[PDB]
Design a protein around this ligand. Structure first.
Ligand SMILES: [Ca+2]
Ligand SMILES: [Cl-]
Ligand SMILES: [Cl-]
Ligand SMILES: [Cl-]
Ligand SMILES: [Cl-]
Ligand SMILES: [Fe+2]
Ligand SMILES: [Fe+2]
Ligand SMILES: [Fe+2]
Ligand SMILES: [Fe+2]
Lengths: 359, 359, 359, 359
């Protein structure tokens, strides 16, 4: 169990950007810029810095050339410069590796702290950042599949209740989670900015990065990404969706970048900013919890996630989940899912919904 | 095999309505009215007459209580009263059993001919129909999932080229089809009204009715139908979708009524009214042909379809397809599909796309 | 007073393209290609040939450099090569000036007839055209404001019943019109292709071209044109809208090209293909007839329109309308409109709706 | 100048509900429930309590029967029960009349404080509220024009800099404003919840309530509200819109309830929760600042607003603005606006845009 420090937590505003290592920068550029239409704040031959349509801070995504594709840093912005110091004291009290760089780790970011957190994740906290031209009314640039904000991260970790307590001490508020009747937690969502989440925990072998998610304005914008990938004949890179989420109620799509880093596109979740925001728990066997329409969850969605790096640039060793597997208990050979609680009609035994089994 | 009559074909305007036999009228009412929001033109203890949002003719759908759920008639409106005579002459020459009713088979339809057509389908031809209030600007009644027009029927028949020639004699013009290099035809689409189709042929054991399709204005209207079904905890009645079609380029959804009659919701296919409209042929192994995003086709979509009735109200016996099965050649144990022709990358062998095997 | 010929009418399919004369080709290119995203089928230093997203014929718009901005031809596609000869004999019997070119008048069109029609309009008829790549699934090229089809023309002519009878004998079916209680006609819509219209008559001094209209898939696409025009700081080129039309029920927008040629963006009217399609007559004083939301009709919309050319390239003489002016009787000093017929509340006298007078 | 208290400001979470006095409860119910589809949390012969689709607190709107239509209270939820005490100490220090009720002023709210604030507005602060079923996934109930959240209030007040200072002391952050080059402020927007605003100040005679705004998910939802109003033949109650705002970048509509209280429908503004969020200042003469497409602002928008009551139920006396009038400086007989700064072309002198003057 991760202890609550005496030191006060930093005041986290929101997820702000992710730094991903990619193996072929030009190919990653094609994906994020030519396919997805993200905007370039800066680039050279080792790094592409990218922002969403509505962003005013320097970037939401840094692509860094490197030998092994992995998450290099998930960054959260904090309220004040003093919160970066608060974050340092907090994590040092946790006994975690910290690195402070007064002019930051990537361009466009100032004084920054990176930590190897209790769950083995490279987190960054910073306040100082270079303001750029906010493109929110730049409809001359607006794509039919326009990504407008960065919404959240999703982390794979073996012991969700352990991680959850830690993120709660750190100030994140749990909004929705998935459990069963035997006390196992499979996933939790938690926020700071007043949307359904800024980060989430998905149970599995970790530390691994499940995905980074971007918002669009409307549902048809997500459809268009799909239609565009069809025209470019890269529909094999649509992993799962599009659909309506049960948890979070967002319209959604999951796609895979050239290094298999998973990107979610997401719109129209709900407001969570009140402190007594009602929490929602779904049962793991509820076939509407992930896809509200009952469409089957793709097995790669449960098994695949990106490596994460430590502060030396080396891959974190993965620890295996010993809690029950969401995959096994829902769509595996001994799995079960229902459409209506207690109704055999519209239930699935030992297979996925809509007539499929695992390949 | 089906000869070209000397009698000139009736001038067919468009598909106009289907008569479906249902086992439980009230349950069916609940699906088509309460769930789908179709508008009642007339009902009693035995039948419900339903129309879409933009229709001026009496109905697009008749639900008729009966012992066995099945198609009783698929109806096409013809240009003039005299075209019903032409239809009678035409099919009489074909040696088909016909039945003429000077005052209609259903309320709100006048002089009509029903036939047992050469493929064993109960076709109806009529001109005369009672006009009703066209609701096209009744936004006070407009649902978030509003079905605005009846678009097409889809028929299951074992020999596609045979059926195709017969419909081509009848005046329908093929727009799109699915073949393989061995020379099998798996499906064909044909129109009269200047959209992708008014009816279509799907290769399989028949005669069966595959589906009836209604259109919406926008893609979000189809999304809302899925969302509604989830909210009613009947997501298990969503058979396939939502998706973008390859053939037709329409946004789509397949759902199932209480008696398992399949209903498609459909929007935004293209104009086909020019006589040299380019025909498009897809390869059966092309994984973007049915779902443009490469989502797998649910096996029941290939295997399940509705019984049809003869003019005595008896079920037509089913003739087995001897040509190759689209299901077997794409997603069965010996089947395969591709994202890019000749690329093994993004190809699927012996199973379906997105990680799934057949249930 | 325009007689119905003995010669049979040519069978017209649909409106197909317009040829506009523009004064500055490069400025026009910026508008139609860079702003509106139309697709180049061919260009040189004198002409630009442009098509919509779903078109397979060579083009829907030709921009021709010349000294005086005007309509050079509105072209309709006919069903067969022989329908071109029919058209020739038709307008010869009407005693109109005709010109035939076995080679076409513009590139990508073959055998073609241009006429100076009884209302002074340069009409073209052709069947032969060069097929091009149909872009309908080219989502890699899809713009957020994508124009997907050519829908219609709208002509300004002083005597509407005169023109209406002529177009009816020509095979156009009237769908909607605007009249008053003492028998004046202010406008009529008429079709061949089974949408609300392929052309329309607006009472006013003519012959003048009111507009050419293009379709989008969805309402938000028309919204994005406005947003993009704001972003380019050319909102002064948005003439009227966006809105919902009363007549036609379509979502709409009117914009002005660099030569003041009016372009309408249009979507989601209804099906009119049945021969007994219910005609709709609106009273001229009904303030929901043009904009369903009651928004005032911009004065220029009633007064401004494009010059038209004769077959010698000279501007046709304008004949003044003597029938009542729709502007005068609705928003002029002695005009009025109503929200609810006979209701003084929500009526406007001597001014437009929403608190405005004519500037 | 309004002094900044020594007492700490209450931590305000967001605007929460407005209480409006209405003259005819049945007609008002017909507007808010039947037309707009708000959800009834409670009602009797005296009051109706209404919430939006995603709300979990008891209500967003209270309609109270009374002799004179007016704003009775604008309510903000605070973060903790102790914050109600702080609001009390804060307003007491300002020398404002306060009233505290441990069991609330209206049903579904517990311990509450109402004040006559330094601008003469009835503000309520509360924490405790009865939770109700959150309808955010009740797609069985979802309207085509569904109002999903409450977004903001907008207040008319003669001295905007004076009210702005006071609101910034209270912890609201200004996101956007409108000024001229002569030191006049015409309007300001300020938030607590991380959208563009929770309240706003519009220069004019005050205290008066300009409007209350509710959000939709998508732009087509706002379109549907207009379409519905056209169908109910109440388009005369559409005051202004629909449009794209310059300030806030939201899609918008203004409508009038039976007592002329103005309601805005609003979607898709941007995230403002970072403490250094860039403030945007628009020039008052910029014709894209209110409607981005350059549509004229209806004069009633600048002149009409609802009375507000003091804590004894009497109408607050109105203090006249002596600062320049936005109407006058832009669309009045000596007004001016521009499309492009420094460009005479697309500018308007002595009248509104798009060919209109004031009625
Ligand atoms: Ca000045
Ligand atoms: Cl999920
Ligand atoms: Cl399909
Ligand atoms: Cl109009
Ligand atoms: Cl505004
Ligand atoms: Fe996610
Ligand atoms: Fe279909
Ligand atoms: Fe038009
Ligand atoms: Fe507002």
């Amino acid at each position: 169990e991760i202890p609550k420090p005496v030191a006060p937590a930093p005041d986290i505003l929101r997820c702000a950007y992710a730094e991903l290592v990619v193996t072929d920068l030009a190919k990653s550029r094609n994906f994020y810029v030519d396919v997805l239409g993200l905007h370039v704040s800066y680039e050279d031959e080792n790094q592409i810095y990218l922002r969403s349509f509505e962003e005013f801070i320097h970037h939401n995504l840094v692509l860094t050339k490197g030998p092994v594709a992995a998450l290099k840093a998930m960054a959260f912005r904090v309220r004040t410069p003093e919160d970066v110091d608060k974050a340092e004291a907090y994590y040092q009290e946790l006994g975690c590796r910290t690195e402070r760089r007064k002019d930051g780790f990537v361009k466009g970011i100032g004084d920054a702290l990176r930590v190897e957190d209790p769950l083995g994740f490279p987190y960054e906290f910073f306040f100082e950042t270079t303001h750029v031209e906010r493109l929110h009314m730049r409809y001359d640039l607006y794509s039919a599949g326009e990504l407008v904000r960065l919404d959240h991260f999703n982390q794979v970790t073996p012991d969700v209740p352990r991680g959850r307590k830690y993120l709660e001490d750190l100030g994140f508020r749990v909004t929705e989670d998935i459990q069963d009747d035997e006390g196992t937690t499979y996933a939790a969502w938690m926020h700071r900015k007043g949307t359904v989440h800024d980060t989430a925990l998905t149970g599995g072998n970790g530390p691994r990065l499940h995905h980074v998610a971007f918002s669009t304005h409307e549902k048809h914008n997500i459809i268009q990404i799909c239609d565009k990938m069809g025209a470019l004949r890269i529909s094999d890179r649509i992993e799962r969706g599009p659909g309506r989420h049960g948890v979070s109620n967002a319209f959604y799509l999951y796609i895979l970048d050239p290094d298999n880093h998973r990107i979610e596109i997401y719109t129209q979740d709900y407001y969570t900013g009140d402190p007594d925001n009602p929490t929602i728990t779904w049962n793991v066997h509820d076939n509407q919890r992930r896809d509200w329409w009952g469409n089957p969850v793709v097995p790669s969605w449960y098994t695949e996630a990106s490596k994460v790096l430590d502060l030396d640039g080396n891959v974190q060793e993965i620890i295996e989940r010993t809690d029950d597997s969401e995959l096994e208990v829902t769509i595996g050979a001994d799995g079960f899912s229902f459409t209506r609680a207690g109704d055999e009609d519209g239930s699935y035994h030992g297979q996925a919904s809509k007539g499929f089994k695992l390949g």
